[PDB]
Amino acid sequence: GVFTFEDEITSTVPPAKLYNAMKDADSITPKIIDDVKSVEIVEGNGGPGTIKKLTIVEDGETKFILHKVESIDEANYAYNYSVVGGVALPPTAEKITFETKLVEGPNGGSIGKLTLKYHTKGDAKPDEEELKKGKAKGEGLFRAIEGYVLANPTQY
Numbered sequence: 001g002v003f004t005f006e007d008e009i010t011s012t013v014p015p016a017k018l019y020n021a022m023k024d025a026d027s028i029t030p031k032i033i034d035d036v037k038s039v040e041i042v043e044g045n046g047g048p049g050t051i052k053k054l055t056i057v058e059d060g061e062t063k064f065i066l067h068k069v070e071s072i073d074e075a076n077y078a079y080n081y082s083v084v085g086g087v088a089l090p091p092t093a094e095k096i097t098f099e100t101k102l103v104e105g106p107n108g109g110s111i112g113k114l115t116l117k118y119h120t121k122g123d124a125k126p127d128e129e130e131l132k133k134g135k136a137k138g139e140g141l142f143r144a145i146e147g148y149v150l151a152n153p154t155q156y
């Protein structure tokens, strides 16, 4: 079954900038996120359908995550990817989809909507700790990309 969750977040960065930085995530994330060591494209050109392998470290052990780029809807400043393999993929889960979309916020900033779609096998439900972990991850990437923009103002 598919279980969807949406959280609303805010940033002081305007959406066009955040969005341009969201597209450079493969370069930005390994710098900022300590556990993330690299992102390699396995198949594709970077657009929808592209498969990426992330190499991370957890407990001094190298582990691998597989991502699939799902859709990149500029008109709605949106960037969507799915975890399709690895330990970021809980044993009882088919797939996890992470969507981020941005609109203008009150004061030149942005309002973000982070969507988590947890695909389970058959009639299983998502494990609550795994959900908590997946939301933290989604928010973490957003705050990485945001952090990089705030710290490197001339680049965006």
Ligand SMILES: Oc1cc(O)c2c(c1)O[C@H](c1ccc(O)c(O)c1)[C@H](O)C2
Pocket (backbone or CB within 6 Å): 025, 026, 029, 030, 033, 035, 036, 039, 054, 056, 057, 065, 081, 088, 137, 138, 140, 141
């Ligand atoms: O081991 C991790 C740690 C993380 O903080 C994250 C991991 C894996 O994977 C995701 C992630 C990490 C880097 C990316 O470039 C990306 O698009 C997604 C998550 O959102 C952030």
Ligand code: NA
Pocket (backbone or CB within 6 Å): 029, 030, 031, 032, 033, 034, 035, 036, 037
């Ligand atoms: Na790193």
